[PDB]
Write a protein that binds this ligand. Structure first.
Ligand code: NI
Ligand SMILES: [Zn+2]
Length: 351
């Protein structure tokens, strides 16, 4: 039945009305009723009547505490990206470097051309990424799709334990320039994420359907056996870049999409994604949850090689939402199998 929704697991785009836009969790459940989640990624274009902020002109003084220079090594569609942290800098400083002759966008006709250039010059002229900047650019009173307070059940983590995890249940801001990249990964605990491109040049995305996630992992393990041997989930290091021609070569299903300023992207549990920025821009993101996520959370395979990695205690979610399974789960005997095609239960209100 849901098997029959988005049979191609293609990236879907939505144009909600303002009445639809007002309840975040509701619209997420809706797009899942339409099979959007099968793609691992979905675009949502907000009503033109809407804006998260009046103007972005006071932010030249905002500090980027930890700019990252992205060194990339590799060949033939396979790359490993190393982060070189640069000293702190303000936005206008970043912007100046970004639009500088050395680091600015090349001229191009169709997107296929800029894309080809990205994959040809990835390892050259390492850019700087203004990544993981704590904060929001939303105006304090915006109540629709506010990344700072979406009110999903992920709120149960801070609510029950007081724990905050930067970028996960708090917002992150991302200042990009041309050729800055995000490597193939799913979210921490295989959560959802939301990404809003506040302003600037586009951000392009690749995505692999959750139902084909394991095949991407098998490929990645084969191409990086040393890292696979060292960590049960080395893709979570977010250092691994794989070109679309390589995915095609090895029969991994995927889709691509370009995100424009003023547009939202949603990633879904266990949706592998990667991409790059076209030029100077600014993006805001955080994670969020639905009831459907809970099983993904319980089964997420986590990085086994670092003390510093995000691990959310699933106990509270299982007690509150799977009370009949708690004893079974705690006893390690819960063998529930995940069906990536099924929408979250909250969509019962639609379906
Ligand atoms: Ni992500
Ligand atoms: Zn690891």
């Amino acid at each position: 039945e849901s098997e029959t929704l988005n049979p191609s697991a293609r990236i879907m785009t939505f144009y909600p009305t303002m009445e639809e836009f007002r309840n975040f969790s509701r619209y997420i459940a809706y797009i899942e009723s339409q099979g959007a989640h099968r793609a691992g990624l979905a675009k949502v274009v907000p009503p033109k009547e809407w804006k998260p902020r009046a103007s972005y002109d006071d932010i030249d003084d905002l500090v980027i505490p930890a700019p990252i220079q992205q060194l990339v090594t590799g060949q033939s569609g396979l790359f490993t990206q190393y982060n070189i942290q640069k000293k702190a800098m303000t936005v206008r400083e970043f912007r100046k470097i970004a639009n500088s002759d050395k680091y600015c966008t090349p001229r191009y006709s169709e997107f296929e051309e800029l894309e080809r250039k990205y994959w040809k010059n990835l390892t050259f002229n390492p850019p700087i990424y203004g990544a993981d900047v704590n904060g929001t650019l939303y105006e304090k009173h915006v109540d629709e799709w506010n990344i700072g307070r979406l009110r999903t059940i992920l709120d149960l983590v801070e609510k029950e334990s007081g724990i905050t995890i930067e970028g996960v249940n708090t917002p992150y801001l991302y200042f990009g320039m041309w050729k800055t990249s995000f490597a193939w990964h799913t979210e921490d605990m295989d959560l959802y994420s939301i990404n809003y491109l506040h302003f600037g040049e586009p951000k392009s995305w690749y995505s692999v359907p959750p139902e084909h996630g394991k095949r991407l992992e098998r490929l990645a393990k084969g191409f990086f056996p040393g890292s696979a041997q060292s960590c049960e989930a080395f893709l979570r290091h977010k250092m691994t870049l794989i070109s679309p021609l390589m995915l095609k070569k090895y029969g991994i299903p995927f889709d691509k999409v370009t995100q424009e300023a003023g547009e939202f992207m949603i990633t879904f549990p266990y949706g592998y994604h990667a991409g790059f920025n076209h030029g100077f821009n600014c993006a805001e993101s955080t994670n969020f949850a639905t009831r459907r996520w809970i099983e993904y959370g319980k089964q997420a395979v986590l990085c086994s090689c670092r003390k510093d990695m995000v691990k959310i205690s699933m106990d509270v979610f299982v007690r509150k939402f799977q009370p009949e399974r708690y004893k079974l789960w705690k006893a390690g005997k819960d063998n529930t199998v995940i069906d990536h095609t099924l929408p979250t239960p909250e969509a019962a209100e639609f379906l």
